[PDB]
Each structure stands twice: as C-alpha cells, then as structure tokens.
C-alpha cells in the first residue's frame, strides 16, 4: 500500500494521490452513466455485457494510474478495433471521464496529468 | 463551513457572501417560479423532472460562485444542445436569476458580481 511505498521511498502515484481502488470505482461508475446518457456513445455499448466491463476498466484504469493490481481484459487494440470509433468519439469519452473526475473532487491539475496518460491510447482505440 | 475556510486564510467566495448553499436553495426555487411563469420559457421545461434540476442548479450556482463542492452534473454545452435556445432565452433566464438574487435580497452589486459569472455560459447554453 501507500505506507510500504513511502517506506521505500518510492514517489506517490496517481492512483493512490487520488484516493486508490475505492476512487476509481467510484469514478469508473460515474463516467459510464455519463457514457450511456449521451447518445452519441450509447450505441457502442448496446451489444455490451456493462457488468463485466465496468470491472475491466476499474483493472485498467487503475493499473494505467499505478496500482498493483492485474488487468485481466483483453488488448487496447484488439478490443476497440472495427468498432467505428473515431478522434471525437473518444475526446467524448475522454471529457465524461475528466467530468466524472472533477466531480469525485480530484483537482483538474491532476486530471490533466491523467488525460496525459490516457489521450496517447487514441491511437489503439480509434478506427 | 465559512468559519473553517477563513480560519484556514481562504478570501470569502461569493456563494459564503450571499448565505452559501441554503441561501442558493431558496433563491433556486423562485427562479423557477418566475421562469416556469414565462411564457416564453416554460415549454422548454415541459416532462422535466424540476425537483432534479433544481438540485443539479444548486449544485452548479453553487460551484460556479466558489463553493466547496464539485459540480456533478452534466456540462452546459451538452445539456444544453438541440434546444435551439438563444440570446433571447438565456438573457430571460438571467433576468429571472437576478430578480429572484434581488428577491432574497442580495446586494446589487453582488449580483451584478454574479452576473459577471454567469453571463460568458451563454456560449455553451446557446
Ligand atoms: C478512453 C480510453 C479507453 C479505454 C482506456 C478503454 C478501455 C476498455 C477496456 C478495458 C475494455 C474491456 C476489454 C475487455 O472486455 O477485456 C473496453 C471495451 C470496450 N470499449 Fe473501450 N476504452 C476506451 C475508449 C473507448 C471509446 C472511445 C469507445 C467508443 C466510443 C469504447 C468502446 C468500447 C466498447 C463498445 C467495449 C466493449 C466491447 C464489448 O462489447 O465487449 N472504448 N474498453
Ligand atoms: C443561466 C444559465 C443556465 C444555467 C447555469 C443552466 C444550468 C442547467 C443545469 C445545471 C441543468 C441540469 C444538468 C443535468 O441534468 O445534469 C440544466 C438543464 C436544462 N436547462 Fe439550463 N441552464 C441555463 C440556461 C438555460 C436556458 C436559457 C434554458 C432554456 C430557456 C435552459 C433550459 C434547460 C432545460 C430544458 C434543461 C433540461 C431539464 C431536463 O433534463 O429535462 N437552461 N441547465
Ligand atoms: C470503454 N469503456
Ligand atoms: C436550466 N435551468
Ligand atoms: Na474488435
């Protein structure tokens, strides 16, 4: 945990400065409500099992920030490829995450350091 | 609270300067009357659940203003697109804003500070 890691001076991570597993469960629910709320994305999701996703990006998402815990999905590329999904669907996706960040609190210096992380996966995830 | 955030040295935000979160609350509620009055308003709002939305504009006047706490709705430009809202609209709406601001009474000056605010949203509601 955070303890461990300070107690070997290693720096701390974006996942636990943003408050760990707990966080980014809370997030991940958050940002696929905005996600299906918003028509231009909703139909990506329609042959989607949402259970079992929102499981998958919880692992990704916290193993992208600098948690310890396995993905256990498939590959970026694999996944999203043949899906139709373009630069602006993803910045729409991107900006429900940023939403969903600000509103679990997270200071929108830090979203941006997460953006950072994230937007260089465009080029696995868009058609 | 306003007495935690001065003694931590934070300057007063407009939302602890008008009465903070129970303030807003009230002045929500007869914006929406006068809104909801306004025949050039109301059909906008028809099948809106109002209960929400009041909670929604609390949250965002309230984030807007400085408050403490995150606005958790959906932003202005998406919520917003498709309605064909214009200028017209939205100056109703400030307009209905500031009288229901003067209503609780609110300093002129503060609600023009609030105004100031409020007014550069125009881009993403319309
Ligand atoms: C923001 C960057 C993104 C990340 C990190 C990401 C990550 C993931 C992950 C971890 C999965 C689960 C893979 C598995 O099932 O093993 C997944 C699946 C999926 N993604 Fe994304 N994704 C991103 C962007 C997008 C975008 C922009 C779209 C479409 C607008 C999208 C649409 C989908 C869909 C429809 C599935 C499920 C496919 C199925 O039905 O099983 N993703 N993605
Ligand atoms: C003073 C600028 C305005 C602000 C701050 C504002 C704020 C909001 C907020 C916070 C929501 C709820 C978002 C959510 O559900 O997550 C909303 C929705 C809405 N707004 Fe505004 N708004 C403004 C101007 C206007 C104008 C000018 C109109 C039309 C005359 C309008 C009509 C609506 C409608 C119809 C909804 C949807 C309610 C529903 O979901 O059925 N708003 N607005
Ligand atoms: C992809 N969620
Ligand atoms: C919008 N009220
Ligand atoms: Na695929």
Redesign the interface.
């Given at each position: 945990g955070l303890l461990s890691r300070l107690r070997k001076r290693e720096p701390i991570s974006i996942y636990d400065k943003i408050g760990g597993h707990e966080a980014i469960e809370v997030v991940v629910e958050?940002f696929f409500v905005?996600v299906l709320?918003?028509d231009q994305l909703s139909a990506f999701f329609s042959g989607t099992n949402m259970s079992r996703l929102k499981g998958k990006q919880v692992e990704f998402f916290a193993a992208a920030l600098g948690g310890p815990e396995p993905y256990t999905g498939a590959p970026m590329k694999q996944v999203h490829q043949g899906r139709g999904i373009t630069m602006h669907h993803f910045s729409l996706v991107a900006?429900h995450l940023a939403?969903a960040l600000?509103?679990?609190?997270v200071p929108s210096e830090t979203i941006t350091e997460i953006l950072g992380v994230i937007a260089p996966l465009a080029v696995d995830v868009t058609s």
């Open positions: 958050d905005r709320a918003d900006g939403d600000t509103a679990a609190g």
